[PDB]
Amino acid sequence: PLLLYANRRDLRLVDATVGGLEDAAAVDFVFSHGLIYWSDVSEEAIKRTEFVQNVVVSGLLSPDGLACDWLGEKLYWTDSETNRIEVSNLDGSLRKVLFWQELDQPRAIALDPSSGFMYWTDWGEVPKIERAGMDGSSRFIIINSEIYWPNGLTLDYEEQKLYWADAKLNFIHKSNLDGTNRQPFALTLFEDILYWTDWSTHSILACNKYTGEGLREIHSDIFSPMDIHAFSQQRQPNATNPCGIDNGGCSHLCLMSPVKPFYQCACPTGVKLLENGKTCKDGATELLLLARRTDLRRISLDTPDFTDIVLQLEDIRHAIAIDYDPVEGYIYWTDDEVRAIRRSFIDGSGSQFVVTAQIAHPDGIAVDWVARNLYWTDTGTDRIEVTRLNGTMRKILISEDLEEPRAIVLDPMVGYMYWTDWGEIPKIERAALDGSDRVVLVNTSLGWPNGLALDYDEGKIYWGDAKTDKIEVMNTDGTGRRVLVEDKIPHIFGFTLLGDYVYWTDWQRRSIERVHKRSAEREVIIDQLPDLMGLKATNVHRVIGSNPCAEENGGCSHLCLYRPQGLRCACPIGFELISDMKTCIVP
Ligand SMILES: *[C@@H]1O[C@H](CO)[C@@H](O[C@@H]2O[C@H](CO)[C@@H](O)[C@H](O)[C@H]2NC(C)=O)[C@H](O)[C@H]1NC(C)=O
Ligand SMILES: *[C@@H]1O[C@H](CO)[C@@H](O[C@@H]2O[C@H](CO)[C@@H](O)[C@H](O)[C@H]2NC(C)=O)[C@H](O)[C@H]1NC(C)=O
Ligand SMILES: *[C@@H]1O[C@H](CO)[C@@H](O)[C@H](O)[C@H]1NC(C)=O
């Protein structure tokens, strides 16, 4: 029997007589494919190697359990810090959060693919051992009576038994699901011999698995046993995959199950499973996009787990404002340090720069998904600019008589552009999409207007205010002013609307609350996630409306700027219209 144990900076084998890492807590293998997976609590990662590759980095905090399904070819792990258990394919793709609720400090995990069951421990105020289906079916609590700091769960498939230790009560028990025999950090099995690692001897102790007698010593001097396993093919019994030729018709994940056909079709986190029961939707249909200062994250509003997948993006340093075009599936954000605006997909792939030049404090960004333009406000230079989503055709759209412009939004199908203002006399303004008809919409009871949402469906606009700590609702002209909620407002404020709910950031920028725009009910969605800056709730599919600009750029040689009264073509900096008001020249 060879024994594989997570050291911490090292990974190594012991007998019967991978290095250069910082804090390993867990280890596993798929002997058939010759793979070895480990977890790093300091590096915040899970990697693999053959006899290195990144597998899960996209946001862990302390993952201590790690188990490989060799039959469904899936990787299961637990994060004691984030209070959730997750599954993924062997290389990390198609990642799914199996559990998240009623979880304290999930530690060790072990699998039984043929039966399709998982097992794990809780290290909270209420420590426990619980099992469920490999598909997250039927959560069942098994051990509650007398345990504190349980760890190193191991199963004997040859004799249908479950072993474990207790790093606080110094026993090694055995059971199965019920009936319990009493017979130490991590532990494993091989044939007749159960090997464990002792908190106070720093050696690998071994004993009989039926009686216990013969308390032999395997290897001394072993200081760090963060996890321990038996490295043998026979530790992973063979079975045919019940999924078969092709994922049992699953479009994505085919996970082992205890019941029915003994396989269950699953979808990655957030995304829903169709009437089919085998095919996923093409991603989540409803997204809450999130701009932290240094990361960028997404929350599906399709599922009640609200899990913020980190976007795989490089160099976010001081992000501020965010928005998204549904037509191309593009995310656009701004960065107060890099002094630029960036592009990318939900994935975080295809990352590109959109604008790099004369930007100071781009506190507001807005996509026009009809005319295919992009607007932003700049508190620094004190002007509202517009390009195309590309970043070309840059034109200064409002500059004179504008001080401290902040949040910006557009109503392309109507022809309206709304923004907030500070300075000498703060206000909410409206113009046509070419800066024309600049009119003041709200004049009084404003201090620091911070965020604007449009309720396109119901002719409403929403805003919030730093100084007055109020979030107000109003008609998009013909007023119906009303303060919907009363709460403190962050200087930089992530404000967004979609559906029947309204998303915003709390004072400390530590949490995102939503409010049912109609009623009043406030439920905190995400917690414990600092440095929130900006938000955009959006329907990735649904694209509402159109105007004449959507066809052949309204016959304009550069910018198509839509008024409710018609349409005017526009020109970049240095350009000028010719005799016909449709073509721009360099005079
Ligand atoms: C269980 O046993 C079968 C039959 O021996 C294994 O056969 C393997 O087939 C795959 C391709 O299907 C080859 O890559 C391997 O070389 C075969 N293994 C051997 C030992 O010859 C089958 O893979 C086994 N099941 C699992 C899940 O690995
Ligand atoms: C970004 O750039 C492309 C390519 O420059 C633009 O494509 C224009 O598209 C129309 C088709 O209706 C052509 O007639 C123009 O000749 C193209 N313009 C140029 C300058 O080449 C387009 O503006 C942008 N892309 C998208 C998808 O909107
Ligand atoms: C805005 O406020 C100023 C100063 O009180 C006032 O003169 C003006 O009439 C107001 N505008 C509107 C549209 O009410």
UniProtKB/Swiss-Prot annotation:
Residues 239-281, 545-585 form the EGF-like domain. Residues 285-546 are annotated as: Beta-propeller 2. Dual phosphorylation of cytoplasmic PPPSP motifs sequentially by GSK3 and CK1 is required for AXIN1-binding, and subsequent stabilization and activation of beta-catenin via preventing GSK3-mediated phosphorylation of beta-catenin. Phosphorylated, in vitro, by GRK5/6 within and outside the PPPSP motifs. Phosphorylation by GSK3B is induced by RPSO1 binding and inhibited by DKK1. Undergoes gamma-secretase-dependent regulated intramembrane proteolysis (RIP). The extracellular domain is first released by shedding, and then, through the action of gamma-secretase, the intracellular domain (ICD) is released into the cytoplasm where it is free to bind to GSK3B and to activate canonical Wnt signaling. LDL-receptor class B repeats lie at residues 34-72, 73-115, 116-159, 160-193, 194-233, 329-371, 372-414, 415-458, 459-499, 500-541. Induction: Decreased levels on WNT3A stimulation. It is found in: Cell membrane; Endoplasmic reticulum; Membrane raft. Disulfide bonds join 243-254, 250-265, 267-280, 549-560, 556-569, 571-584. Glycans are attached at residues 238, 390, 443. Widely coexpressed with LRP5 during embryogenesis and in adult tissues. Residues 1-232 are annotated as: Beta-propeller 1. It is linked to Coronary artery disease, autosomal dominant, 2: A common heart disease characterized by reduced or absent blood flow in one or more of the arteries that encircle and supply the heart. Its most important complication is acute myocardial infarction. Tooth agenesis, selective, 7: An autosomal dominant form of selective tooth agenesis, a common anomaly characterized by the congenital absence of one or more teeth. Selective tooth agenesis without associated systemic disorders has sometimes been divided into 2 types: oligodontia, defined as agenesis of 6 or more permanent teeth, and hypodontia, defined as agenesis of less than 6 teeth. The number in both cases does not include absence of third molars (wisdom teeth). Component of the Wnt-Fzd-LRP5-LRP6 complex that triggers beta-catenin signaling through inducing aggregation of receptor-ligand complexes into ribosome-sized signalosomes. Cell-surface coreceptor of Wnt/beta-catenin signaling, which plays a pivotal role in bone formation. The Wnt-induced Fzd/LRP6 coreceptor complex recruits DVL1 polymers to the plasma membrane which, in turn, recruits the AXIN1/GSK3B-complex to the cell surface promoting the formation of signalosomes and inhibiting AXIN1/GSK3-mediated phosphorylation and destruction of beta-catenin. Belongs to the LDLR family. Homodimer; disulfide-linked. Forms phosphorylated oligomer aggregates on Wnt-signaling. Forms a WNT-signaling complex formed of a WNT protein, a FZD protein and LRP5 or LRP6. Interacts (via the extracellular domain) with WNT1; the interaction is enhanced by prior formation of the Wnt/Fzd complex. Interacts (via the beta-propeller regions 3 and 4) with WNT3A. Interacts (via the beta-propeller regions 1 and 2) with WNT9B. Interacts with FZD5; the interaction forms a coreceptor complex for Wnt signaling and is inhibited by DKK1 and DRAXIN. The YWTD-EGF-like domains 1 and 2 are required for the interaction with Wnt-frizzled complex. The YWTD-EGF-like domains 3 and 4 are required for the interaction with DKK1. The PPPSP motifs play a central role in signal transduction by being phosphorylated, leading to activate the Wnt signaling pathway. This is Low-density lipoprotein receptor-related protein 6. It comes from Homo sapiens (Human). The lineage of its organism: Eukaryota, Metazoa, Chordata, Craniata, Vertebrata. The chain holds residues 21 to 630 of 1613 of the full protein.
